[PDB]
Amino acid sequence: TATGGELVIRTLERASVDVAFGINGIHIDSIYQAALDRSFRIVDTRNEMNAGHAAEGYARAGHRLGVALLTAGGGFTNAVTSIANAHLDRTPVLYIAASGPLGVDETNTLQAGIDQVAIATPITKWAHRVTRVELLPRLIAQAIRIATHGPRGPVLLDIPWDVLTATVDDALADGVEELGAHALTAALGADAVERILDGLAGAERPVFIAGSELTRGDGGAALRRLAEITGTPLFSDTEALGAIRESPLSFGLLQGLFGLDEAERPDRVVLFGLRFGLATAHGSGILIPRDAAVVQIDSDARELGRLQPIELGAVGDPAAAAEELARAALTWAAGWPDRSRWQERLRELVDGRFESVTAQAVRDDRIHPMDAVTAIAETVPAGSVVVADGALTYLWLSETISRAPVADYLCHGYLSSMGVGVGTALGAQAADVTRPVVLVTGDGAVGYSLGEFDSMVRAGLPVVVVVLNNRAWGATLHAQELILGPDRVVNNRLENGSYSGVARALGADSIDVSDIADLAPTLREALASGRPTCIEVHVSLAPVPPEENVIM
């Protein structure tokens, strides 16, 4: 005899998940009861929105499946921003949402009468309602297989209250559904491996660029090895920075490719799990030349050649491909040409840009954001997770993050949803409570999730939230003031409030920083203290980050 909720927890244990995020409710309580009996950890939040974002950050920093538990009705709809974000970011998250009882379908009853499946269908890989309790293990397994294979993404399983409370025979609870233990991701074949390596061997100025899919499959070690065997410079979007950072061949974020002379532009570019899109400057060719030979490895054929021509596309798992390529490159009969001059030209370009951005900063009476994000980048411990939110804030941080020794940099995806950072950081912290998690966020974004300071305190999750306070919704203010004029700024000033005060009232440690020389020492004491912390930094609004310009 086992309840539906017991069947959920048992199947999740078999998938090696040991934490889920949610807010309790009567519709979903049989899962909470089962979890208590099996010592399965559920971390509560102050908004289901951040239970979802926590599931994402846990998945992104933990390189694993995240799980969010949502009660019926508003517990589901509050998570929809997180589902959409996981959808565009290709993040493997299983959302388990309870529903109204089928036995009282269409009775205008509590938290019921909304088609949660239909709401989530456009932003999930699969969304499905379980209508009988005996299906639960089989259907959960199917959901887990879909979310954790490429392109990874979110799955919603909607479970009616009276399916969760129904019971099944122990033999039905027993037995194993395929979760992924026996599953092998697609590789590259030997002919493809030989052709890709041969193109790489013929290039004058090649470059590798990694994206989220390589990170999700733990292909960092194999891609770094392949770059090191072949001497190929390694770049990445923000989601794969942690995967390339350790390599002496890492040059950081691919935005640093901007600005080479026309005769020095890369002639060959091999993409591992990176789509054409916002991070590549679309198909404009200013990072990845349109006339380069582009080789694209991705899990979805719709992405191949999407915005610019490719010489070769391969549909398959970028991590598995990096491993096959690394093995064949080690025994490559001709060996690999010396690429040290090309590597050095790239080092100059990327170091030159950092030195210029820092030197060109015009400082006023407040902390310059470049100073603040340099201080933070140069202070975090090796192995830290850095999470970024706000807009001017993350554009500034993007100029220095490539130098930080991060295990993972968790920044905005295409959804670019101001406000996701606090719940993202909280979940990343839960993937390893001993690993530092530093959230760099703006004063606008942080106001979405102030209540989660209480969640961090009660769960023992010692995130350090650094607020860059420019008293404004900053990038949107900039758009009006720079395009249309100072008289055209409207609905963007935020000249009120103390975020450190808010964090203090919620039990977190808190400090204001007005002088740049206090910032790094305060961040160090925050990391040493083992406690959730808010550091409010009073930064200047006027400076325009370089990535804002190249978009202008």
Ligand X SMILES: Cc1ncc(C[n+]2csc(CCOP(=O)(O)OP(=O)(O)O)c2C)c(N)n1
Binding site for ligand X (CB under 6 A): 23-25, 48, 71, 74-75, 78, 111, 390-393, 416-419, 442-445, 468, 470, 472-476
Mapped onto helix, strand or coil, the DSSP state of residue 267 is coil
Q: 6: burial class by Cβ within 10 Å (0-12, 13-18, 19+)? A: buried
Query: Of its own copies, Mg ion, ligand X, none, which one sits near residue 84, judging by CB under 5 to 8 A according to partner kind?
Result: its own copies
Smallest distance from ligand X to CB 403, Å: 20
Asked whether position 536 contacts Mg ion by CB under 5 A, the answer is no
Q: Which of residues 391-420 bind Mg ion (CB under 5 A)?
A: none
Asked whether position 470 contacts Mg ion by CB under 5 A, the answer is yes
Query: Of its own copies, Mg ion, ligand X, none, which one sits near residue 499, judging by CB under 5 to 8 A according to partner kind?
Result: its own copies
Tell me whether residue 99 or residue 299 sits nearer to ligand X (CB atom): 99
Tell me whether residue 137 or residue 444 sits nearer to Mg ion (CB atom): 444
Query: Of its own copies, ligand X, Mg ion, none, which one sits near residue 496, judging by CB under 5 to 8 A according to partner kind?
Result: its own copies
- Helix axes of 519-529 and 369-377: crossing angle, nearest 10 degrees: 40
> Do 471 and 447 touch, CB atoms closer than 8 A?
no
Q: Which of residues 298-317 bind Mg ion (CB under 5 A)?
A: none
Query: Of ligand X, its own copies, Mg ion, none, which one sits near residue 260, judging by CB under 5 to 8 A according to partner kind?
Result: none
Whether cis (ω within 30° of 0) applies to the bond prior to 405 is no
Smallest distance from ligand X to CB 391, Å: 3
Please state, as a whole number, how many other Cβ atoms lie within 10 Å of the Cβ of residue 184.
7
- Of the ranges 222-230, 298-306, 307-315, 466-474, which one interacts with Mg ion (CB under 5 A)? 466-474
> Do 442 and 392 touch, CB atoms closer than 8 A?
yes
Tell me whether residue 249 or residue 477 sits nearer to ligand X (CB atom): 477
In degrees and rounded to multiples of 5, residue 98 shows phi and psi of: -80, 160
Q: Which secondary-structure segment (H or E) carries 396?
A: helix 392-397
The token pair that represents 188 in the structure block = 């590259």
Query: Of its own copies, ligand X, Mg ion, none, which one sits near residue 113, judging by CB under 5 to 8 A according to partner kind?
Result: its own copies
Query: Of Mg ion, ligand X, its own copies, none, which one sits near residue 118, judging by CB under 5 to 8 A according to partner kind?
Result: its own copies
Distance of alpha carbon 523 from alpha carbon 545, whole angstroms: 23
Smallest distance from its own copies to CB 350, Å: 24
Interacting residue with Mg ion among 239, 443, 454, 548 (CB under 5 A): 443
> Do 103 and 93 touch, CB atoms closer than 8 A?
no
The token pair that represents 405 in the structure block = 């020794």
The token pair that represents 209 in the structure block = 């660029």
The token pair that represents 90 in the structure block = 């290709």
> Do 282 and 376 touch, CB atoms closer than 8 A?
no
Cα pseudo-dihedral 42, 46, 48, 53, rounded to 10: -80
Tell me whether residue 358 or residue 476 sits nearer to its own copies (CB atom): 476
Asked whether position 441 contacts Mg ion by CB under 5 A, the answer is no
Tokens 């532009």, located at residue? 265
Smallest distance from its own copies to CB 333, Å: 38
Smallest distance from its own copies to CB 190, Å: 31
